């Protein structure tokens, strides 16, 4: 370990934050990070002893969350219900429970399958002061949830950018081109 | 007719290997010029009669398969060989040889296949003297017969 | 080309089978796009033979 | 076949099947298009010959 100790003087550490960023700056329910100092080691370790580490605050899962004014980040990764939104007519003053997890069987609105699937994404309970048609998000990644903000187009672009998604999309494309070419060459 | 097609192809290959003399080359040039003018470089659908249109299109498709597609295949093989050579030389993928070398190979191989199969294309246009195409074909056939001091159908 | 047309893809899967073979189904398109060319060309040749 | 033979064995990547009961409602209808096309082709050819 002599070499490691010698080089440790000039070795430098780098931050452990990556593309995912910090969740407390985008999720109201995520508390700011806090460092906990372990107590001194136990001189005697009894077979039936319990941890002396300082307790961490416990935040239970809320039944529903309010409307984030364009600053919504899902707690977990939701299922992509659809790649384009739903043009739904909302009534004035009626409370709607938009589905966040993305597996709801009742459409954009929560059906209860969030309680049956393992996810921290909770339904968004919101109200509208003016009745009319709104585009409700289906990919469940919109920052303006429950309202669509054209994030599904970027999700589609990322799917096409991925190596396997590109392959799937263009394999289907060439499969249809097979029909097109058969029609074009039908007469020979 | 598969037997006839095989026999004709083998006869053409044997003749090409044998070579041609002055008279044969002149007759082949006349036939190739006629075929290119009346079939390859002309829209067959513009002829008058349905029979002549259909037979001219059959001749055009036979010419396509026996000359254009074969030349494309051979030129593509040559371009692929050159592409492999350049890929080995540069230790990477190159795209320039494909178009240029393919075009050069097609230009090199089209004349030889056209010379090989000139007689078949000329003979497939013998629709009959009752039509313009057949009359021109008969005129060219008479000229070739006069040149070669022989008679052909 | 299937579930994409549906805005509830989970419902699509559940109501069809409650099973997930979408990965294989969408990967198979690439292979199916070319696995048929020799058969199609030989069939064209056979059809021409029948016409003759 | 390839996926099942390569990953679904206990050794490689078993999956915890938590689903209790099926919920398909129209998968049979969707699948029966192919046998439907088979029957249509059979009927067409048979009737044309008849």
């Amino acid at each position: 370990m002599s070499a490691i100790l010698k080089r440790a003087a000039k070795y430098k550490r780098v931050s452990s934050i990556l593309c995912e960023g910090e969740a407390h700056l985008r999720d109201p329910f995520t508390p700011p990070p806090v460092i906990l100092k372990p107590p001194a080691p136990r001189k005697d370790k009894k077979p039936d002893d319990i941890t002396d580490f300082p307790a961490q605050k416990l935040i239970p899962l809320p039944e529903s969350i309010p409307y984030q004014e364009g600053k919504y980040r899902p707690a977990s990764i939701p299922m992509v219900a659809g790649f384009f939104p739903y043009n739904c007519y909302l009534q004035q003053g009626k409370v709607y429970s938009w589905c966040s997890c993305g597996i709801s069987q009742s459409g954009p609105w929560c059906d209860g399958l969030c309680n049956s699937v393992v996810t921290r994404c909770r339904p968004v309970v919101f109200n509208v002061s003016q009745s009319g048609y709104y585009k409700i998000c289906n990919c469940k990644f919109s920052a303006n949830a429950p309202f669509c903000n054209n994030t599904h187009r970027k999700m589609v672009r990322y799917h096409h950018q991925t190596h396997r998604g590109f392959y799937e999309i263009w394999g289907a494309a060439l499969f249809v081109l097979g029909w097109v070419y058969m029609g074009f060459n039908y007469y020979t | 007719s598969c037997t006839t097609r095989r026999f004709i192809d083998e006869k053409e290959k044997l003749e090409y290997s044998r070579g041609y003399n002055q008279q044969e080359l002149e007759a082949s040039k006349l036939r190739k010029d006629f075929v290119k003018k009346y079939i390859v470089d002309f829209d067959t659908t513009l002829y008058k009669t349905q029979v002549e249109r259909d037979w001219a299109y059959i001749a055009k498709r036979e010419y396509r398969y026996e000359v254009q597609l074969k030349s494309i295949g051979y030129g593509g093989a040559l371009a692929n060989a050159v592409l492999l050579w350049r890929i080995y030389a540069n230790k990477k993928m190159v795209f320039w040889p494909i178009p240029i070398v393919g075009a050069l190979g097609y230009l090199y191989f089209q004349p030889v296949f056209f010379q090989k199969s000139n007689k078949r294309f000329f003979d497939m246009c013998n629709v009959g003297e009752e039509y313009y195409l057949g009359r021109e074909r008969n005129k060219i056939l008479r000229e070739c017969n006069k040149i070669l001091n022989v008679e052909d159908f | 080309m299937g579930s994409v047309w549906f805005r509830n893809r989970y419902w699509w899967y559940r109501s069809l089978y409650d099973d997930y073979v979408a990965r294989e189904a969408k990967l198979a398109f690439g292979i199916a796009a070319f696995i048929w060319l020799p058969h199609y060309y030989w069939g064209i040749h056979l059809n021409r033979a029948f016409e003759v | 076949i390839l996926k099942v033979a390569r990953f679904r064995v206990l050794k490689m990547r078993p999956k915890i099947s938590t689903s209790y009961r099926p919920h398909g409602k129209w998968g049979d209808f969707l699948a029966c298009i192919i046998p439907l096309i088979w029957c249509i082709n059979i009927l067409t050819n048979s009737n044309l010959i008849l």
Binding site: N185, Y187, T188 | - | I44 | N41
Partner: peptide, 20 residues
């Protein structure tokens, strides 16, 4: 069916009589 044969050789014309 609609395009079960997947191709038709319409190019193949009726053989032309070549009798004298």
């Amino acid at each position: 069916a609609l395009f079960f044969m997947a191709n038709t050789a319409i190019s193949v014309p009726s053989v032309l009589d070549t009798s004298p």
